[PDB]
Structure formats: C-alpha cells, structure tokens
Design a protein around this ligand. Sequence first.
Ligand SMILES: [Zn+2]
Length: 54
Amino acid sequence: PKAKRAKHPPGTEKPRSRSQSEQPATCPICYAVIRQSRNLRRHLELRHFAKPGV
DNA sequence: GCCGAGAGTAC
DNA sequence: GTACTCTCGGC
Ligand SMILES: [Zn+2]
C-alpha cells in the first residue's frame, strides 16, 4: 500500500539520539531561530530562496 | 501559514 | 555506534 510515517501508533519512545544529534540553528538572512539544522535548510527555501528560480 | 519533532537506514 | 532524510501534526 503506502507508508505515511504515522507517529500515532503506541510504543513511540522519544530517544534523545534524535533531538540531541541536532543543535540550535540561526538564519544569517533574517536571524530566524531554527532549532534543528535540517529545518534551517527548509527555512531557506520558504523564507528566502522560495522565489521561482531561473 | 510556518514551525517542531518521529521513524528507518547506511556506512 | 551516529547522523542522515522524509513525514506528520499543531498553535
Ligand atoms: Zn531567514
């Protein structure tokens, strides 16, 4: 079928090896404070490079 | 409307 | 043994 990563099923333990590996992140354009670095990238495409490229 | 975090895998 | 990516839900 498919596989929507549903966090609804029980037994969802929160190991820190998921949030600890990530470290605070700031945007050097609008100083937006993004916690996870992976999200920082997404912030670039939404609040800056979100313009149609060429 | 954007943001914050969970899971599975590979080397 | 760790960090990686994609995905979902919330105020
Ligand atoms: Zn920014």
